[PDB]
Design an enzyme around this catalytic site. Sequence first.
Site, PDB file in Angstrom:
ATOM      1  N   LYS A  65      54.686  29.097  22.421  1.00 43.03           N
ATOM      2  CA  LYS A  65      55.919  28.280  22.334  1.00 43.03           C
ATOM      3  C   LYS A  65      57.091  29.123  22.946  1.00 43.03           C
ATOM      4  O   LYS A  65      56.946  30.352  23.104  1.00 43.03           O
ATOM      5  CB  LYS A  65      56.205  27.878  20.883  1.00 43.03           C
ATOM      6  CG  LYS A  65      56.794  28.993  20.050  1.00 43.03           C
ATOM      7  CD  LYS A  65      56.282  29.080  18.622  1.00 43.03           C
ATOM      8  CE  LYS A  65      56.303  27.799  17.827  1.00 43.03           C
ATOM      9  NZ  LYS A  65      54.989  27.182  17.750  1.00 43.03           N
ATOM     10  N   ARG A  66      58.224  28.524  23.317  1.00 42.84           N
ATOM     11  CA  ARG A  66      59.341  29.374  23.799  1.00 42.84           C
ATOM     12  C   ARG A  66      59.742  30.448  22.746  1.00 42.84           C
ATOM     13  O   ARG A  66      59.595  30.247  21.521  1.00 42.84           O
ATOM     14  CB  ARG A  66      60.576  28.542  24.198  1.00 42.84           C
ATOM     15  CG  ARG A  66      60.360  27.594  25.333  1.00 42.84           C
ATOM     16  CD  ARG A  66      60.373  28.322  26.657  1.00 42.84           C
ATOM     17  NE  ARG A  66      61.689  28.846  27.010  1.00 42.84           N
ATOM     18  CZ  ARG A  66      62.457  28.345  27.976  1.00 42.84           C
ATOM     19  NH1 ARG A  66      62.048  27.306  28.713  1.00 42.84           N
ATOM     20  NH2 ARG A  66      63.639  28.890  28.208  1.00 42.84           N
ATOM     21  N   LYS A 118      62.079  30.553  15.727  1.00 43.74           N
ATOM     22  CA  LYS A 118      60.643  30.266  15.727  1.00 43.74           C
ATOM     23  C   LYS A 118      59.910  31.465  15.163  1.00 43.74           C
ATOM     24  O   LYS A 118      58.715  31.394  14.861  1.00 43.74           O
ATOM     25  CB  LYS A 118      60.146  29.882  17.106  1.00 43.74           C
ATOM     26  CG  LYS A 118      60.499  28.471  17.581  1.00 43.74           C
ATOM     27  CD  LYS A 118      60.481  28.436  19.123  1.00 43.74           C
ATOM     28  CE  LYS A 118      60.811  27.067  19.738  1.00 43.74           C
ATOM     29  NZ  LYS A 118      59.831  25.996  19.352  1.00 43.74           N
ATOM     30  N   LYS A 146      48.894  19.794  18.910  1.00 44.08           N
ATOM     31  CA  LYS A 146      47.841  20.070  19.885  1.00 44.08           C
ATOM     32  C   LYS A 146      46.742  20.918  19.253  1.00 44.08           C
ATOM     33  O   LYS A 146      45.576  20.765  19.564  1.00 44.08           O
ATOM     34  CB  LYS A 146      48.396  20.775  21.123  1.00 44.08           C
ATOM     35  CG  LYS A 146      49.427  19.979  21.891  1.00 44.08           C
ATOM     36  CD  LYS A 146      50.325  20.935  22.683  1.00 44.08           C
ATOM     37  CE  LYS A 146      51.655  20.284  23.075  1.00 44.08           C
ATOM     38  NZ  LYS A 146      52.383  21.134  24.024  1.00 44.08           N
ATOM     39  N   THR A 203      55.491  20.216  18.494  1.00 45.90           N
ATOM     40  CA  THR A 203      54.376  19.422  18.959  1.00 45.90           C
ATOM     41  C   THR A 203      53.156  20.271  19.296  1.00 45.90           C
ATOM     42  O   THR A 203      52.012  19.787  19.214  1.00 45.90           O
ATOM     43  CB  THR A 203      54.771  18.547  20.104  1.00 45.90           C
ATOM     44  OG1 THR A 203      55.301  19.377  21.123  1.00 45.90           O
ATOM     45  CG2 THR A 203      55.826  17.556  19.663  1.00 45.90           C
ATOM     46  N   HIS A 258      67.073  15.987  18.977  1.00 50.79           N
ATOM     47  CA  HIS A 258      65.946  16.914  18.912  1.00 50.79           C
ATOM     48  C   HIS A 258      66.192  18.202  18.152  1.00 50.79           C
ATOM     49  O   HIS A 258      65.334  19.074  18.132  1.00 50.79           O
ATOM     50  CB  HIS A 258      65.495  17.255  20.307  1.00 50.79           C
ATOM     51  CG  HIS A 258      64.894  16.112  21.031  1.00 50.79           C
ATOM     52  ND1 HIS A 258      63.559  15.800  20.940  1.00 50.79           N
ATOM     53  CD2 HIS A 258      65.437  15.202  21.872  1.00 50.79           C
ATOM     54  CE1 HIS A 258      63.296  14.751  21.703  1.00 50.79           C
ATOM     55  NE2 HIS A 258      64.419  14.367  22.277  1.00 50.79           N
TER      56      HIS A 258
HETATM   57  C1  LIG Z   1      73.582  17.528  21.571  1.00 50.58           C
HETATM   58  C2  LIG Z   1      72.640  17.768  22.754  1.00 50.58           C
HETATM   59  C3  LIG Z   1      72.088  19.204  22.777  1.00 50.58           C
HETATM   60  C4  LIG Z   1      70.559  19.380  22.704  1.00 50.58           C
HETATM   61  C5  LIG Z   1      70.042  20.845  22.701  1.00 50.58           C
HETATM   62  C6  LIG Z   1      68.531  20.924  22.569  1.00 50.58           C
HETATM   63  C7  LIG Z   1      67.393  21.055  22.530  1.00 50.58           C
HETATM   64  C8  LIG Z   1      65.898  21.164  22.467  1.00 50.58           C
HETATM   65  C9  LIG Z   1      64.972  20.695  21.519  1.00 50.58           C
HETATM   66  N1  LIG Z   1      63.580  20.979  21.775  1.00 50.58           N
HETATM   67  C10 LIG Z   1      62.439  20.541  20.887  1.00 50.58           C
HETATM   68  O1  LIG Z   1      62.059  19.162  21.133  1.00 50.58           O
HETATM   69  C11 LIG Z   1      60.736  18.867  20.634  1.00 50.58           C
HETATM   70  C12 LIG Z   1      60.449  17.400  20.967  1.00 50.58           C
HETATM   71  O2  LIG Z   1      61.162  16.536  20.073  1.00 50.58           O
HETATM   72  C13 LIG Z   1      60.614  19.147  19.083  1.00 50.58           C
HETATM   73  O3  LIG Z   1      59.246  18.957  18.577  1.00 50.58           O
HETATM   74  C14 LIG Z   1      61.157  20.547  18.700  1.00 50.58           C
HETATM   75  O4  LIG Z   1      61.133  20.676  17.253  1.00 50.58           O
HETATM   76  C15 LIG Z   1      62.596  20.761  19.363  1.00 50.58           C
HETATM   77  O5  LIG Z   1      63.226  22.055  19.110  1.00 50.58           O
HETATM   78  C16 LIG Z   1      63.212  21.661  22.899  1.00 50.58           C
HETATM   79  O6  LIG Z   1      62.019  21.921  23.126  1.00 50.58           O
HETATM   80  N2  LIG Z   1      64.182  22.125  23.826  1.00 50.58           N
HETATM   81  C17 LIG Z   1      65.535  21.864  23.590  1.00 50.58           C
HETATM   82  O7  LIG Z   1      66.438  22.227  24.352  1.00 50.58           O
END
Ligand SMILES: CCCCCC#Cc1cn([C@@H]2O[C@H](CO)[C@@H](O)[C@H](O)[C@H]2O)c(=O)[nH]c1=O
Lengths: 810, 810
Positions: A542-543, A548, A654, A650, A351
Site C-alpha cells: 500500500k502507499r 497506515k 484483494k 481495498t 475518501h
Molecule cells: C477534499 C478533497 C481531498 C481528498 C484527499 C484524498 C485522498 C485519498 C484517499 N485514498 C483512499 O481511497 C480508497 C478508495 O475509497 C480508500 O479505500 C482508502 O481508505 C482511502 O485513503 C487514496 O487512496 N488516495 C487519496 O488521495
Amino acid sequence: QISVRGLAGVENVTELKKNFNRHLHFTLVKDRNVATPRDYYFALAHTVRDHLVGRWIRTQQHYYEKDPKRIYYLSLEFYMGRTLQNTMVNLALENACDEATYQLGLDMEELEEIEEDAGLGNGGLGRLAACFLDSMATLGLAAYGYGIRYEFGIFNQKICGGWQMEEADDWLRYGNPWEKARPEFTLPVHFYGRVEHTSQGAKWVDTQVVLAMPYDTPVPGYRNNVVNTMRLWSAKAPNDFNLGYIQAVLDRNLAENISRVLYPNDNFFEGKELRLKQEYFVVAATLQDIIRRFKSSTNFDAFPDKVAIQLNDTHPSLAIPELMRVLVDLERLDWDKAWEVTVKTCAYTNHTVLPEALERWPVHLLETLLPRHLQIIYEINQRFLNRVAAAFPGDVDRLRRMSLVEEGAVKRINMAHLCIAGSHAVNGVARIHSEILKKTIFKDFYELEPHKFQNKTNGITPRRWLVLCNPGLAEIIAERIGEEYISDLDQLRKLLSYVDDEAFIRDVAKVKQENKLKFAAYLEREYKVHINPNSLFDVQVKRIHEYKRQLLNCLHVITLYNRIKKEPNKFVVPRTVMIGGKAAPGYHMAKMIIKLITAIGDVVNHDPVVGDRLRVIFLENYRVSLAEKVIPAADLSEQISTAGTEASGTGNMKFMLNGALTIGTMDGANVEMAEEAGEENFFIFGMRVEDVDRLDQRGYNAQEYYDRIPELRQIIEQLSSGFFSPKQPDLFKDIVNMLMHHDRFKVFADYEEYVKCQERVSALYKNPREWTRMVIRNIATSGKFSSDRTIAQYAREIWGVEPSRQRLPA
Amino acid sequence: QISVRGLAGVENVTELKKNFNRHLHFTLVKDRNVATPRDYYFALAHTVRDHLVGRWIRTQQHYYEKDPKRIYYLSLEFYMGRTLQNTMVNLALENACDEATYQLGLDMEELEEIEEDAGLGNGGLGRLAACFLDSMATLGLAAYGYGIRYEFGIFNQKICGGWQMEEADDWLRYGNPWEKARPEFTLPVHFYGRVEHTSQGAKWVDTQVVLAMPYDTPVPGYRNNVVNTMRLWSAKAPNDFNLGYIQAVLDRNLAENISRVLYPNDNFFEGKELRLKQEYFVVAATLQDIIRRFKSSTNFDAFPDKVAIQLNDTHPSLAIPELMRVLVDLERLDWDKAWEVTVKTCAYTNHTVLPEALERWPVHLLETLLPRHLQIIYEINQRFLNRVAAAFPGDVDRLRRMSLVEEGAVKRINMAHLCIAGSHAVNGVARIHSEILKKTIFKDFYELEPHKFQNKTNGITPRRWLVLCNPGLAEIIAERIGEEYISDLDQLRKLLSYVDDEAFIRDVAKVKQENKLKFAAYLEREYKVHINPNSLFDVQVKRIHEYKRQLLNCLHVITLYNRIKKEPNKFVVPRTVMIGGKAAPGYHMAKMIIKLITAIGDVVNHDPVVGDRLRVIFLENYRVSLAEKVIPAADLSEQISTAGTEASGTGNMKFMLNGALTIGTMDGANVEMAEEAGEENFFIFGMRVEDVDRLDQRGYNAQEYYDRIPELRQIIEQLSSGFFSPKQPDLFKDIVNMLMHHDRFKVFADYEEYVKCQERVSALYKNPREWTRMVIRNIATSGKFSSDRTIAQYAREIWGVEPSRQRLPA
Ligand SMILES: CCCCCC#Cc1cn([C@@H]2O[C@H](CO)[C@@H](O)[C@H](O)[C@H]2O)c(=O)[nH]c1=O
Ligand SMILES: CCCCCC#Cc1cn([C@@H]2O[C@H](CO)[C@@H](O)[C@H](O)[C@H]2O)c(=O)[nH]c1=O
C-alpha cells in the site's frame, strides 16, 4: 489448459494465428526474423483489440437507439494497470490466444510481461475508479469514465542505498494500442479573463483557450458483450496560440503542460495552480461532452433523468459551479431552476477524514484563474447560508462552520462543503467511515439534510483480483461450484460446505504453495534476492503513510529479531516479511520510513544466527501489476492503520479473496470483513475508534509506553544509538523523535496488543490444516466485497437505474 | 478513366473495397453512418499503405543479402508535400482506387484534398531533397534520407489586411499514417560536457544526453517495386532526466524542443543555439545508424566502399568532425587514416553564393556546446593550412582567406570551408553557379584542389511534377509516344515531330485551358476571388526575397496599369498576374513586399476602367500542394532574379514541363533551359552576369534610371505619394528608399528591358497557334531537367555506384 480460461476451438485458434501474422506484417512492418518480444506483444495486442471493436460500436449504437440514463464517473485518477489479459479474460479468449501463440512458438506469459501499467493513479482512489468501470460494464450500465490522459503517470520507484529515487513513467514511449485518438471531438477550455455584466447577464471574456482532445479506451464487460468507454482528455494549444516566432511555437508547451504529469501526493494537499488547471480542464471538457450528448436525444427539466455525474472526491468539484455557469450564463435558465437540475445531477463520494487531505483552494487563485466560478460559488454560499439561518436561527457558530468560504489569514474555499451543498447524495466508502462523517466532520451538514448521507462500502472486481491474477484458485473453486460466481460473488458462500472436505483443504493449500513458489522465483530472476518459500509470507503493500503505520510493522519485525538474538536455539515459525509502497516525493517522513525498512533488512538479512528464519524485503515499485503477483502469494495481510483513519481500504479485500488471513485493527472495511467472516476467523487487535478518542482527551503521552515496555525501550534505544545505521548513527533521530513526541497515530499504544496478536498468528500457522480451514472461511465470505455489489448499490440508491446482467448480441 | 493511371482490374477493385471497409471498421473504429470525409481519407490511406509494406520489407531484405554501397542523404529539410496520390501513382493503383472509391460512393479527389502537406522544408532546397529521394528509389539506389521529424513545419501563411500572419503548422494533429515509429532503434546524442586527456587519448565527459527516436517513412520507386526509407529523428528526454519532482518532469520539454519546429529562414543565417543543436542532433544520431549498419556486414578501409554521405548544404557539416570523433576517439584509428576515410566518404552540395546565407558559427557557441568537435576542427584547420603553405609558399593572404577559422570581433568557424576541406567532391547546382563558385567564392580552394569541383544541374521528378499534377498533359503525351518517358524523360524530344501536327496543337492547348478553368474555380470556392480564364496567367511563385525580384514584377504590373489608365480604349492582352510565396518571419523587407502586392491588388482590382483586363492576385499559403495546382495552370513563368544570384532554381523547371513559357534572366538553370530549347523559344531579358560586374565597378546609381525613364519616375512618385496606401501615405517609404539608395539587386537596371520583353510576350500570345507551338518546343526539350538525370550523375561521378532500372520481384 484450465477451464475458466474459455474454449480453445479449432476455428478461433486458426483465425487468431492469421490475424497475428497479419498484424505483425501490416501493422508492425516486421517479419519473423527481426521481430522482438515487444513486436510479438504488439501483434497479440492488436489481434485481441480487433475482437473489441465490433462490440464497442454496437454498444455505442445500442445506447443511442435505447437512450437510457447515462452515468458519468469523473475522476482525476484511473489506475488501470495492464489491459491485455483483462481483455482476453472478459472476452473468453484466454485459452484460444494461449493455444494460438504456443503454436506460433511463443509463450503468452512472457508476452504479457512486456505491457506497461497505465499508472494513471496513486492508490486506492484511482484503483476504485478502475474496478468501478469494469463493474459498470459487467452490469450493463451506460457509463463513461472521464479523466485526463497524463503523459506521465505515477513515477517508477528505484531504491539506491535504501532511499527511494523517482523516475519518470514514460508509459507511452512505445505506443498504446488500446486507445483511439478522436481529434474530431476537440473542445475548447477557457482560463483567466474577467467577468463583464450586461443587460443580458454575466459574460466571461478575454480568456486563454486550451483545447482538450479526447482519447477513447474500450472497457469490456464480463462475457456480456458490453464495451463502454473511458474518455481521457489531452491538452493541446490552439494554432494561433501566442500568434519571436520560434518562442511562440516553443511556448505551446505551457498549455499542454496541463495533462503532462499526474500529481503524486495522496497524503497532503498542495494549492498549486497547475493542479487546479487540471481539475478545471477535465470538468470543462467533460461537461460539454455531457451536454452535447444530451442535446442529441431547450428543456433541461429532463436533464437529471438522462444524466448522472459521480464525483470521485472533491477533485472534480468544479463540475458543480461549471454546470451552473453553463445553465445560467449560456442556456439562460434562472438560478433556482439550474440549481435544482445541478443538485439532482451530482453526487459526491468522500475518501478520507484526514484534515490535511481536504481541498481548500485559496480565493486569490480562483479569482485569477476562474473568476466567474468564484462569483457563482459566493452566490451559492449565500443562498446556502440562508437555508441554514432559517433552519437554525441564532446559531452564528453554525454559520461560520458551514460556510463554503473559510475566513482566515488567506481566505479559502472548502471544496467538500461545496460538494455537499450541490449534490443530492454524499457517501462514505465503508460503514464506519460513513458514521464518522455523520458524527464528526459533516455533522452540521447531516443535521440540515440527513437524507443526503449514505454508505457504499467499497469493493474490488473479482475478474482482475481473482480470475486474472489467481487462475489456480479460480479453477478449484469452479470445480466445486461452477463459474457463475465470477459475476455473482455471493455464491462463494457455497464453499462453506467444503470446510471439512479433505480434498478441497489440500487443493486450497496446494494453490497457495504454488503462488508462493512462483513469486519466490520472480524475486530471484528480476531482483537477485533469496527467500525460503516455506516461511509464512507476511505482506504489507500500500502507499507509505504515517496513518497506515508501516512503522508499527517495523517495530514488530525488530522485536522478532531481538527475541531470536536473545534465545537463538528456540523454535520460531519462520517468516518472510515483505513491505512495499511508494512515498509521495515531498513527504519527508514517508521517505525515512522506506529508508528504515531497508536498514532493518541490511541487519536482519545478513545475521548468520537468524538463518532463514526471518527475512525482511522491501518490494520495489509497488503498483497494480506487482499487486497481481504478490497478493495471490500472501499468507498474512497487514491492515494496521490507527482506528478511524483508513476510510475503507481495498487491498484488504484483494487479500481476503486470495487466501491470506488478515491481521488488522477495527478500521474501515476491516470491520465488515470480520463481521462477514466471524471475528474468530480474523486477527483483530488494538484500540477501537472509541479508545482513540478516550486517549485524545487524556492526551497521548508516548513516554508512558516507553517506560513500561522493556521490549519497546530496547528498540528505541537501538534506533537512537545507531544499531541500524552504523555509519550515520543519528540517521533515524527524526523518527525516534516523532514516535516519542508527536505521533498523531499512536504507534506505541497498539504495540503491545499487536505483538501478542502476531504470536497468535504464528501459533495457528504451525497447524497447516486449521490455518487452511480458516482461509476457507475467509474466501467463502468475501462475496460482499465485489465491486459488482457496490455498483448495484450506487445504481439503485443514487443514480436511479437498474443493473442488467443480460448479454447483448455478438 | 485515363491510361497512365494504370489498370482497374476486377480483382484489385474488389480487394481495395474490402480492405477499405476493414480499415474503416478495425482501424478507425467507425461505421458508414458516423464516418466523415477525414475518416474516409484515412481508410484509403491505410489501404494504400498496405501495398507498400510487403515491398518495403523485401527491399530492406534485398539490401542485406546483396550488401551494395549505401547512399546517405543528410538534409535538415525534406519538403515532401502529400504522399497518398504519389504512392498510388508509383504503385500503379490510381485507376483501381479511383474505381474502388467511386463504387463505395466516394470521390477520391475530395479525399486527396484532406491530406496535410508534410512541409518539412522552406523551398527549393528541401524540395530538391524530396525529388532526389523519389529519383533515388526509381533508380534502384540503396539510399536513405536522414533528417529531423519536426513537430511543426513551415508555418501556414494567412493574410490580414494584406499583411502576412504566421500560424503553427500542426501537421501531426490527426496522425500521419505513413510513418512507422521505431522506438527500438533509439540512440543517445551528447551535448555540453568537457574534454579530458588521458594516456589513451581524449574523452568527452559530463555531457547531457538527449535521445533520438527514429521514424521511418516509405519512399516508393516508380513501378519498380523498390521502396527505400526516409528516417527522421525525434528528440526525447531520458527517464532519469533532471532526476521539485513536477518541474523535473515538466523540464523534459527543454530536451525535446530540439525537434519541435523547423527554422523558417532561407535568406539570412542566424547563429541561434537551438539551430546548432538541431544540426548536431541529426548528424550524431545518423552517424551511429550508418556505423552500426556498416558493422553488420575493426576494418574501416572498406568504409568508403560501403558508405557515401551527401551533405545538403553545410547544415549537416558537423558530420565531418563527428566522423573523425568516432573514428579517432572511439575506434582508435590514427588521424591520418580516419581523415582519408572521412574525405573519401563525404561530399558537399552548395546552394548559394549570397554572403549573408553562409553558416559562420561563433566559436564561443561550439566551445560550450560541442567542445571536442572544436578541438577537431582546429586540428583540421592547422593540417589544412600546412597543405596550403606547402603549395603556395609565401602567400600569407591566401592563408587568412582559406582558414576554416575567421579572425575578427567574434571568432567564427566558416562551415563551407570545412565542407570543402573534408569532402572529395564539391558541387554547384547549375552550370553557371558552378563556374561562379570556381571563379569567385571558392577560387582559392579550386586552385589547391581542382579535382574536387563538379557541377550537377538540378532537376525535378516528373512523377510528381507531371504525371501527378497534370494527368491530362501526361495522357496526350502518352497517346503519341508511349509511357516509357515517365522514367526516361529524354524521350520527350520525340515530341518535336508533332510541332506542326494540328491535332496535337489543339490537344496541348485544350489541356492548358482545362487546367486554367479548374484553377479559376479553385480560386472562387476556397478564396472568393473572381478571375477571367481567357487571360494570360502570369505567375511568380517561390519564397519572397529581394534577390528574386518580385519587386521588379510589381513595377511591371503598375506600369501595365498606368498605360491602361492613360489610353483606356486601346486593346491590351488581358492578364491575371499571380504572385505567391512565404516571407521568413523576421525579414522585414520581404513582408513589406507582400504588403505592396496586396495594395496594388486593392487599387488595380477595383478600377472599373480596367475591367477584367488586369487582375493582381496574391496566392495565400504557397506550398507544395498549391504548387501542384497553379503550375499546370500557368501560361507565363516568371524567373527574374538578378543574374548571378539564383544558384539554379527548380520552379522554373516545373513550369517548362507543364506548358508555360518562361520570361527570365540568364541566371541559374534558366541558362541551360534556354540552351536546351533554343533562345528563340525563350523570353530572355536583362543583364548577363558580366553586365552586373561592370555595373558594380562603376557603381550602381539608381537615380540615373529614375531621371531617364518617365514611366519609372511616375511609379516611384505614386509609391511615395500614397497612391497605393491612401490611409498611410508614407507606408512604402522603406521600399522607395531601398530602391533609390541601396538596392543590392539592381531592380531599376533591368526595368526597361523587362517591360519591352513583356510586350513581346503579349504579342505572341495574341497568336494562339504560335504560342502553343513554342510551348511544344519547351516541353519537348525539358528532358535534361529530370531529377533522374541528376541522380544518375551523382551516382556515377560522386558516389561510385550504377543506377539500375530493373524491377525487383512483386
Ligand atoms: C477534499 C478533497 C481531498 C481528498 C484527499 C484524498 C485522498 C485519498 C484517499 N485514498 C483512499 O481511497 C480508497 C478508495 O475509497 C480508500 O479505500 C482508502 O481508505 C482511502 O485513503 C487514496 O487512496 N488516495 C487519496 O488521495
Ligand atoms: C553555408 C551554408 C548556408 C546555406 C544558406 C542557404 C540556402 C538556400 C538555398 N536554396 C535554393 O536551393 C535550390 C536547390 O538547389 C536552388 O535551385 C536555389 O537556386 C537556391 O537558392 C533554398 O531554397 N533555401 C536556402 O536556404
